[PDB]
Homo-oligomer: A and B are copies of this chain.
Amino acid sequence: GTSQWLRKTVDSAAVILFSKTTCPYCKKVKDVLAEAKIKHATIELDQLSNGSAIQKCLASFSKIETVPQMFVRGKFIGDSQTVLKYYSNDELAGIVNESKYDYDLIVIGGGSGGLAAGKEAAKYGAKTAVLDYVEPTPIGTTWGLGGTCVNVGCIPKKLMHQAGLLSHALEDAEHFGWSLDRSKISHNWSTMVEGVQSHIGSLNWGYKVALRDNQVTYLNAKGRLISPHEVQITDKNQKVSTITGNKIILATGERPKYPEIPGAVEYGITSDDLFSLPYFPGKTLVIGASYVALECAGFLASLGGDVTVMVRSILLRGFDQQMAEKVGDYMENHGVKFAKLCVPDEIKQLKVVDTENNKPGLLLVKGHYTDGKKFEEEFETVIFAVGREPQLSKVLCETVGVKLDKNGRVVCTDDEQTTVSNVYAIGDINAGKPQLTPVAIQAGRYLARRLFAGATELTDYSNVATTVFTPLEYGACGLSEEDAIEKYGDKDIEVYHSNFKPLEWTVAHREDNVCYMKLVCRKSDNMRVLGLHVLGPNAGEITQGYAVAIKMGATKADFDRTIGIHPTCSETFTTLHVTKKSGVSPIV
């Protein structure tokens, strides 16, 4: 057991020192490596449960049982005297840089997971390259380093959501005594986009600075894995070349899908285009019903746009459908129109986009409802949000031998290993995992530590909390009510629930009984909390802390014995008592 861990660590680590905190011979070697600017991992044996067994096991590689012992890429280098011999003779730098490969690690993809993996690996002395290339959208949109979340995802969408939230802050301010007249204030799209894009630009630059200061090689090039250790790269001049790496991490993410109908690619756009669009979209149609579709429709309506959402079947498929229906009902009462049970058939162009005068075009959308009836209406902008997919045929030659699933995602072990032993996959392309930015970052950092610092900790993908940033936000952690009932049976499920009203909404004359929360619990397991759900302002801040308690196995009694903080929205979770089975109203 211990023997197999130590073998794996020695073979994989780039530069690793086995040391003790008390030893001055170890302090002597650490200081030498620091002066020579040699980064390395360190294992302190006097601080591990079974460091005494490891010390004896090191002898199988070095034939000595003492400390310090320094290894490079699986090879024993020497003890104190020998390392200082190499340093005094100017032989050290050459020894620590000898490798069968150009790099200890090549990361294909410079997004959430890839940048986190590459930076963490470099901390332990791995010689690392990060490759990133942004294939342009059909109308030619492109952006800088950092991936989907930074450039065309979580960051710009939450900034535009905040711009939408401030419209109701302006309305509320009158009732709290401020002298403004909300009816005479308007919004400027391009001023918003300029501020959002300036922030994104500071993140692009910050990542390039971060990589340089960690001695990571950044190549703005398209990568393709052609054999287990060879990556073919193509740069901006279509210069093709080949680099080699010991370990490979695939982290290339996904892009938006388009439906197979006339005019979609030619005349519609996706979220990839929306966040840097140089003109206001105007009267807009959003096709789809995912969290992307609803978040974008929501802030466009709050900025004063004429917005319609066309829904094929249900909202937020895969989320709790009671909460999804409450989300949509709020949006419809606050100025989002819905075309329900409806799909598109074709998009026709009536006016070309006026790139000169900074104006949208004009389009005719034709479709049909699910019973047979027809749809026909004109829009200035049409946004498709009908899912996202990887395209690993661009990234990965089928001869390498990496197994994909029926959706095109990489099949991995619980330590992110593919069917090719030195190749790993993280983030949205890892089959079956939640497609979220903090998941990708944790997977990447934790993997880098296992490869290059002898760590053993795995990423836990269960009960990962989420928030949908619709105009009224929806936070969740754990099972939906319908999934719990299917898994355990209705007689074993108890649901506590309540409406609430934010104190901030009282003076502002907002709605009494639209905010809502529930706990879905398992009777036969001490009323264990299976799922937590909340619709209300600041829902992500409310939900986050409870995710720790659910990870630790919270019960209803744990929520009951904890005291609330007053006045807050969150405290309503500490005093829930109305059950669904009782039939008593949840209103306040």
Contacts and interface: CB of A to CB of B under 8 A. Distances in A.
Interface in A182-212: 185-189, 191-192, 195-196, 198-199
A567 B563 CA distance: 27
A551 B544 contact: no
Given A538-B541, A543-B565, A549-B554, 16 more contacts: A149-B566, A154-B567, A159-B506, A163-B176, A166-B172, A177-B195, A178-B187, A179-B188, A198-B507, A438-B563, A438-B565, A460-B561, A544-B545, A545-B546, A547-B562, A551-B562
A312 B12 CA distance: 61
B542 A159 contact: no
A242 interface: no
Given A180-B185, A544-B542, A175 B195 contact: yes
Contacts of A570: 540-541, 544-545
A558 interface: yes
Contact of A566 (B189, B438, B504): B438
Contacts of A475: 565
Contacts of A460: 561, 563
Contact of A155 (B154, B503, B561): B503
Contacts of A366: none
A464 interface: yes
A332 B238 CA distance: 58
Contact of A569 (B541, B554, B568): B541
Contact of A541 (B173, B507, B568): B568
Contact of A176 (B166, B173, B503): B166
A217 interface: no
A548 B546 contact: yes
A465 interface: yes
Contacts of A558: 548, 551-552
A158 interface: yes
B188 A177 contact: yes
A38 B540 CA distance: 46
A169 interface: yes
Contacts of A172: 166
Given A436-B566, A563-B439, A177 B155 contact: no
B561 A551 contact: yes
Contacts of A465: 563, 565
A574 interface: yes
Nearest to A443: B563
Interface string A522-558: 0000000000000000101111111111011010001
Given A199-B506, A544-B568, A568-B541, A170 B178 contact: yes
Given A541-B570, A544-B573, A549-B545, A179 B173 contact: no
Contacts of A192: 176-177
A499 interface: no
- Interface-centre pick from A188, A467, A565 (highest chain B CB count, 10 A): A565
B185 A179 contact: yes
